[PDB]
Amino acid sequence: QVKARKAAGVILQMIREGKIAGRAILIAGQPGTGKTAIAMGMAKSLGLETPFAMIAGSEIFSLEMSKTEALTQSFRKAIGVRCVTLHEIDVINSTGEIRSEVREQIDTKVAEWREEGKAEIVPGVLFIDEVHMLDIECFSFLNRALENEMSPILVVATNRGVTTIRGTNQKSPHGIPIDLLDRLLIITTQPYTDDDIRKILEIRCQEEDVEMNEEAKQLLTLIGRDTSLRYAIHLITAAALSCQKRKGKVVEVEDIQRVYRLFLDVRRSMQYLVEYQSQYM
């Protein structure tokens, strides 16, 4: 993820200069390709003191509170004063209704403390995974919230191509309305190559205190290529435990053979049950 990180850095330099204006960001790529890592790195590189908020597309349907209430809480969480976020000010002054008096108090207090040269307001970053799951009312609320001057930088993320906007019949790119899509800087994340998979598995083996020879490492890199990286990450732990049961001190090609034979990936299991269902009818 070099080109995507480069594009994120360009948007960071845009945000520092104030050129982002009413626009937002979309991360469009296959699942589990460093989306949240990109967003968290973006928020950190804005500043370690910068607030950050995260939410999944399906979390708003938790039914504890409405969709727009959860989106309002996520938006308020991604704004700060310095430290305390506006969600924390709401909790201190409390769920209930977000009264407009808190915004007036924020404006007057931050103006007074900025006059004193002691504190200022800071916009943060709000990250929305699985934006294609958002309803059309949620997109209208997103436009309404982004219209406010206090709004943070929005980073939506999708892993879906052209699809129906959920709750309507119109098919649009990424399941997003058009009017949002004309003002989104779409960062695309490419799939991982052999060297990236090898480096990631090396870092994970270092983190797991697992040592492996080069033959097993290359075989695992091939497994990660042909069966996605996360399955290889699971096989690292499984093969470490198999080697521990074998009373060895290093995990070899025999252990990878055993673990690959035992624990299936999604493709082979899906194929096996599809073949059964073809036989069964």
Partner: protein, 130 residues
């Protein structure tokens, strides 16, 4: 006759292999009732390294019987998905015994050079000795 039929899928192949596992006679004649051209359609990544070694050894059982079909079958085994990692997944015991089978069966003096060249060309990429 009715016990040995064409498998339609890797599910069918594996469930025939399990039932006929202990008896090699119904495994050496199993490969005759199926077309090797259908083999990469039968296996759609559902092929493990022990099954690969078993099927290669079973083709070696009736190598001399229909030599062309053997060098077709092994060639068709190259067309399965995830073949490269599969041959990379072989343990040293299977690697050594495949080398032994190469010098014994698939590179004997009986076979003609026409099939021998193709078999050695494929075996250059199967064993990957280095």
């Amino acid at each position: 006759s009715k016990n040995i039929k064409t498998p339609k899928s890797a599910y069918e192949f594996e469930n025939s292999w399990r039932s006929f596992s202990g008896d090699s006679a119904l495994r050496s004649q199993l490969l005759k009732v199926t077309t090797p051209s259908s083999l990469p359609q039968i296996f759609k990544n559902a092929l493990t390294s022990p099954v690969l070694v078993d099927i290669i050894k079973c083709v070696a059982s009736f190598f001399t019987e229909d030599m062309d079909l053997a060098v077709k079958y092994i060639e068709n085994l190259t067309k399965v998905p995830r073949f490269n990692m599969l041959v990379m997944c072989l343990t040293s015991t299977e690697k050594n015994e495949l080398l032994k089978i190469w010098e014994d069966v698939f590179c004997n003096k009986a076979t003609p050079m026409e099939y021998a060249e193709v078999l050695d060309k494929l075996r250059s990429r199967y064993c990957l000795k280095q």
